[PDB]
Every structure is written in C-alpha cells, then in structure tokens.
Ligand binder design. Sequence first.
Ligand code: HEM
Ligand SMILES: *[C@@H]1O[C@H](CO)[C@@H](O[C@@H]2O[C@H](CO)[C@@H](O[C@H]3O[C@H](CO)[C@@H](O)[C@H](O)[C@@H]3O)[C@H](O)[C@H]2NC(C)=O)[C@H](O)[C@H]1NC(C)=O
Ligand SMILES: *[C@@H]1O[C@H](CO)[C@@H](O[C@@H]2O[C@H](CO)[C@@H](O[C@H]3O[C@H](CO)[C@@H](O)[C@H](O)[C@@H]3O)[C@H](O)[C@H]2NC(C)=O)[C@H](O)[C@H]1NC(C)=O
Ligand SMILES: *[C@@H]1O[C@H](CO)[C@@H](O[C@@H]2O[C@H](CO)[C@@H](O[C@H]3O[C@H](CO)[C@@H](O)[C@H](O)[C@@H]3O)[C@H](O)[C@H]2NC(C)=O)[C@H](O)[C@H]1NC(C)=O
Ligand SMILES: *[C@@H]1O[C@H](CO)[C@@H](O[C@@H]2O[C@H](CO)[C@@H](O)[C@H](O)[C@H]2NC(C)=O)[C@H](O)[C@H]1NC(C)=O
Ligand SMILES: [C-]#N
Ligand SMILES: [Ca+2]
Length: 595
Amino acid sequence: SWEVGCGAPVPLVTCDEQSPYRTITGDCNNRRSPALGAANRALARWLPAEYEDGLAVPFGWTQRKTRNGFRVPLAREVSNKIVGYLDEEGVLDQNRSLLFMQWGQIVDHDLDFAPETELGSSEHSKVQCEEYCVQGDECFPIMFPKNDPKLKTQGKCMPFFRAGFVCPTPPYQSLARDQINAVTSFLDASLVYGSEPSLASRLRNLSSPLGLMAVNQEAWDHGLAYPPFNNVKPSPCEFINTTAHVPCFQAGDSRASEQILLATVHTLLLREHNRLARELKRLNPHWDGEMLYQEARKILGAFIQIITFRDYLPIVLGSEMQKWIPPYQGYNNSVDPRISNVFTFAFRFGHMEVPSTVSRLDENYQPWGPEAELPLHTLFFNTWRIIKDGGIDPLVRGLLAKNSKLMNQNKMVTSELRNKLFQPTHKVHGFDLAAINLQRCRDHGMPGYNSWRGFCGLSQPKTLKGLQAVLKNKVLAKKLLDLYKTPDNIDIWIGGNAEPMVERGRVGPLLACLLGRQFQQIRDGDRFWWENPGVFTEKQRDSLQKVSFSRLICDNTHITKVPLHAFQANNYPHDFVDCSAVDKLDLSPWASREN
Ligand code: HEM
Ligand SMILES: *[C@@H]1O[C@H](CO)[C@@H](O[C@@H]2O[C@H](CO)[C@@H](O[C@H]3O[C@H](CO)[C@@H](O)[C@H](O)[C@@H]3O)[C@H](O)[C@H]2NC(C)=O)[C@H](O)[C@H]1NC(C)=O
Ligand SMILES: *[C@@H]1O[C@H](CO)[C@@H](O[C@@H]2O[C@H](CO)[C@@H](O[C@H]3O[C@H](CO)[C@@H](O)[C@H](O)[C@@H]3O)[C@H](O)[C@H]2NC(C)=O)[C@H](O)[C@H]1NC(C)=O
Ligand SMILES: *[C@@H]1O[C@H](CO)[C@@H](O[C@@H]2O[C@H](CO)[C@@H](O[C@H]3O[C@H](CO)[C@@H](O)[C@H](O)[C@@H]3O)[C@H](O)[C@H]2NC(C)=O)[C@H](O)[C@H]1NC(C)=O
Ligand SMILES: *[C@@H]1O[C@H](CO)[C@@H](O[C@@H]2O[C@H](CO)[C@@H](O)[C@H](O)[C@H]2NC(C)=O)[C@H](O)[C@H]1NC(C)=O
Ligand SMILES: [C-]#N
Ligand SMILES: [Ca+2]
C-alpha cells in the first residue's frame, strides 16, 4: 500500500473506555480501532478512485484526455439538457410531506460534510477563479456551453473549488487523493452539538450548571429560543438583506442556514435539548451540568436515529428496505461504520425532491399574510424572514401541510436550484447545484455508473437499447448517450437518480443499494446504537419507542394541530389532531436515586 497511518485529525484525544457517553469527535466508538467513524478523517472508498492521471486529476480537466475513449461532457450541458424543466405543475409528491425532503437534509448533515479548500487567508486566485475562469490548482471551473443564457448575463463560468482532502492541505503525492469527512459518521446529532471540541464548547451555556445550549440573546420567538447569532463578518445572511442586518445562526454544523426550513429544524432540535435538560433537572436536582448536557444529548441522538430508521428510511427504500437493512441483531465490531465517498453523492437524490416555493401558514393552516408563498431562491441564507417575519411556527405548519417535489425523469431539479442557487462566498443567485453535483463526482474520483451497477450486483448497460430497458425511458436514455457516449461514463449522481423508483420507495435499485448498505453499516457498527443492550435501560427504551416528529413540534412550538404521521401527505384538517392525542416522551425512567 501507500501509508496505513496517514493524516491531520484532531490531535490529542484518549478513550475513557468505560464512559457512558459518545465523544464529540466520534473517536473511541470502536474500541479496537478508535479513529473509525471519527470526524476529520477520509471518506471511505468502497471502490478504487478514478482519476484522469490515476491519482488526483479529475476527469474533465485535460481537454485531450478521454474516459474510455470519449470526452466527458460539461456538467452544465448535462444540466441544461437532462436536468432542467420549466413547468412546476404536477410535480408534487402526492404522498410525501415537505418534511420528507427536509429530514433527508438533516440526516445528511449529521453524516457527511466535505469542505472546500482555502490555504487562502487572503487569496487572489480566489478571484482568478471567479473573475477569469482560469483552471488551475484547486480552481476547477464549471464552463458554460454554447448557447447557455448565462453566457449573456453571467460570464464564462461558475467558479468551483475542489474538495479538501487528507493527510495535508498541500498539492502532494502519496496514495490516490481521498476527500475528508469533517463530521462524525455516526447518526449522533453532531449537527446540533458540533464535531470538534472547540465548536462544541462554544455552543454550550457554561455560565450556569444547567447543561443548556446557548441561545440567542437578541431575539425571541414568543418566549422560545433561537440559536446564537454567528457574529463573524462578513455574513452571507446579512448580505442578502443589507438592511435587515440579520446574521446566520450558529449551530453544530456550518451549513445550518443554507435555507430557511433547514434553519427551522435546527431550531426545534436546539429547543428540544434545552427542554430535555430542564426536565432532567426537575427529576434529578442533584445532577451537575456535565451530566445534564450528556444525558440530554444522548436522548437527542436516540430521537434522531429512531425517527430516521423507523419513519424515514422505510419510505425512501420501500420494498428494498428489508433486503438491505434486516432487523437489528446487535453491535458488530467488525463492521466499518465510515461513510463512503460514493454515499455523499447517492444521498443527494434529495436535490430532486425540493419544490420551487415555501409557504407560511397561520393557525387555521391558511396563507399567512400577503406574501405567504415565496420562491425558494430568496430563502437561501435567509434568517431575516424568520426573526423578522413570524418566527418558526408558520414555517413549521408549511412543512406539515405542503408536499415535497416528486422525482420525475422529465422534471429533475427545479430552476430555483439549477439556475438561481446562492453560494455563501459569491454574490449572485446564479449558480447551478446539479452542475455542481456533476463536477463534484469528478472532483471526488467517482467510478462510473456501470461500475456501481456491478458493485450492487445489477446489470450493466452496454447499449442504448440496454439503457432504455433499465431506465424504462427511450428519450432519457438517448440524450444521456448523446452526451456520454457510453453508459460507463455516466456520472454516478445523474445515473443513479435516472432510474425509476422501486415499489413504495423514492429511489431506484442502484441508489437503494448504495443507501441501504451504508445505513446498515452505521447502525451495526455503532457501539452507541440506542437498541444495543447497555446504552439505555430497558425501561428507557420503552419510553423512546414512543417519540415522533409530531411530538417534537408540540413540545417546542405553539402549533397545536399536527398529523400523527408527519412524513406522508396530510390534509388539513381531516388528518390533523390536537397535540394531546400524540404520545409524549416519558422521562421517569431517567429518575436516578441516590442510596
Ligand atoms: C439548498 C439545498 C437544499 C434544499 C433546498 C438541499 C437539500 C438536500 C436534501 C433534501 C438532501 C438529502 C435528502 C441533500 C443531501 C446532500 N446535499 Fe444538498 N441541498 C442544498 C444545497 C446543497 C449544496 C450547496 C451542497 C454542496 C454542493 C457541493 O458539492 O459543493 C449540498 C450537498 C449535499 C450533500 C453532500 C454533503 C457532503 O458530504 O459534503 C448531501 C448528502 N447541498 N441536500
Ligand atoms: C402514504 O404512505 C404511507 C406510508 O408509506 C402508506 O401507509 C403505510 O403502509 C404500510 C405498508 O405498506 C404500513 O406499515 C405498517 O402499518 C401497519 C398498521 O396497520 C402495521 O400493523 C404493519 O406492521 C405495517 O408494516 C402502514 O399501513 C402505513 N404506514 C404508516 C406508518 O402510516 C399509505 O398507503 C400511503 N398512502 C397512499 C394513498 O398510498
Ligand atoms: C445561560 O443560562 C442562563 C440561566 O438560564 C441564562 O440566564 C437567563 O437569561 C434569561 C434572559 O436572557 C432570564 O430571563 C429573564 O428575562 C427578563 C429580562 O428581560 C427578566 O425580567 C425575567 O426575570 C426573566 O427571568 C433569566 O432570568 C436568566 N436566568 C438566570 C438564572 O440568570 C442565560 O441567558 C444563558 N446564556 C446563554 C448565552 O444562553
Ligand atoms: C429587508 O428586510 C426588511 C425587514 O427587516 C424588509 O422590510 C420590512 O418588510 C416590509 C416592507 O416590505 C414591512 O412590513 C410591513 O410593515 C408595516 C406594518 O407591519 C406596513 O405598514 C408596511 O407597509 C409593510 O407591509 C416591514 O415593516 C419592513 N421593515 C422595514 C424597517 O422596512 C425588506 O423588505 C427586506 N428587503 C429585501 C430586499 O429583502
Ligand atoms: C460482523 O459482520 C462481519 C463482516 O461483514 C461478518 O463477518 C464475515 O463477513 C464476511 C464478508 O461477508 C463473510 O465471510 C461472512 O458474512 C462473515 N464470516 C463468517 C463466515 O462468519 C460477521 O457475520 C459479523 N459478526 C457477527 C458476530 O455477527
Ligand atoms: C444539502 N446540503
Ligand atoms: Ca454524525
């Protein structure tokens, strides 16, 4: 091999080994191999990387180089031809609420983040990439094709910087290049608490022995808290409304404010921790602050794993669920819990589930005000519509009463994301998420569609006729091959998402396999999985089975009408009940007695 002991982790940590609590970084989960699943380590490779020069140069970089004999097509062209559509009508998912899309994003943020590069405390190429579209070093621009309207209006490209990678931060030369996962691989609410000790400690309220998370001191939502403001300037959230001067929120994860509905769920989660910590202080007046924090935290981790595995996964994977995720049989220390590189692209099926608008509803679940429904592109990095325009309740009702967008082979990704995305570093609402997904697959050394079809034990299309049969669509198959010139070159993201959906699910066979095996691994390779004997007591697990997202809303908002099954499509008011009908989480089992 090339080094088995390489890298730039968090330095000096040692395992307690008989401690009830997860570490913040994820170290010490696996006794035998402590760094497994820890944050700031390389994403795992389930298959060897594919680079133009075998090591680090992505396909698409050199113009004369081919992949299997052909030029790879430009990400934006694939975007323009396959991914865009104009008419938003009829695209809604008739049996999935907007919360279905939004939870996907929460789970994702808990599992994987692959940061971009700097080594530019002040850079000037950071401007050579934007201003001039010059490829080079970590600038890998998305060039516009001939006849792209953004040419007329935007320039020659969209800037794009390669993903950070292990060992160093420098150009290098050891093993093939591996990207970093800056968060913990375990579903452990790292998105609320942080994945590094410094951020984790900054998010806490250490001014009092109550094990609380710090809340914003400038704004309140009917007596309920908001996260802290991230008071580092310049702020993306301030930039979108020079006048409101409302900054981004501070959470355990830096993307928290990417969009308003994401900021919203982060807020409920923060609020739930504090609720939990208060409740455990009435029950155990003798507990110190550290114990309150850790105990509340452990519960919150179990809520996220439960909602995810009991309510969310079954409706993404449908009939494939049991094929890839059998009933839990206990912790297996031989299982690799790392998130794989390919999963961070497979989990992006979610991009096709985002609708063009977001609504605010009032207490009768009717349009809230004259500007109730808003285009998604104005909600990127937008915290001012929250703080200054209703708080989170009207947003929360929207999440329950509105639908997600349905993946559709003819209508993939809304123009709100495909033409009008806002990137926190630049200043235009003019980027293309789809094109970015394609560029990123290449950046990350992904194998092609057929390599993954094979990995998953599925047939590999060698012909147009074969691709037609697999996609079950003549027209999609043909545009795809007019661009790629062989199924082997199709980027995993577009190939995976082009497959028709398995029965009672929302992803096709390939994605169901990639998703499925990954989820099986993080549950079975987790020493702190909630069902593993010894983590919780039996009585404690009997209480946890009764959690729901609907209850989380009742305890942390002023929404008083919710559905019993929040992920499916719900109509008001037939499918909405009063909060009193929804099970509460009983904490008596956490009552500790002295003698
Ligand atoms: C704005 C964005 C969203 C909502 C309006 C959104 C939504 C989702 C859903 C619902 C996901 C899963 C079900 C999901 C997964 C992942 N995303 Fe995506 N997303 C928005 C915007 C972005 C941006 C920008 C990125 C970074 C793109 C890049 O490559 O530079 C992004 C990424 C991801 C991602 C990979 C994360 C990682 O491992 O680094 C998902 C698993 N999303 N999003
Ligand atoms: C909207 O989606 C719903 C969930 O995807 C779906 O109903 C679900 O159907 C599944 C089986 O396909 C059932 O799962 C479990 O529920 C029963 C309760 O009667 C249990 O006893 C069984 O163990 C069973 O496995 C549920 O009945 C149901 N899921 C939930 C949690 O509600 C609807 O059919 C969809 N609506 C439409 C119009 O298709
Ligand atoms: C860390 O936790 C501290 C303890 O809860 C907390 O202090 C509490 O702060 C709130 C307001 O910030 C106070 O609530 C009071 O608000 C009005 C002022 O307009 C008063 O008139 C009322 O008495 C009301 O109680 C709490 O009194 C205060 N509690 C204590 C015991 O000091 C901090 O705010 C938390 N720090 C962070 C950064 O979140
Ligand atoms: C930047 O954010 C501003 C809010 O912080 C926002 O201005 C605010 O929004 C509207 C104006 O469009 C006003 O709402 C209503 O207020 C009173 C009564 O409540 C009405 O009489 C007004 O007619 C209006 O409908 C807010 O008062 C207003 N606040 C201020 C101080 O202007 C801007 O719209 C945001 N700008 C952009 C470009 O996003
Ligand atoms: C823990 O999971 C591991 C790894 O998947 C299992 O160990 C073996 O895995 C290989 C690879 O598929 C296969 O040979 C078998 O599935 C397993 N070996 C045999 C012959 O037992 C293992 O089943 C799990 N450990 C426990 C105790 O369940
Ligand atoms: C999406 N992040
Ligand atoms: Ca995590």
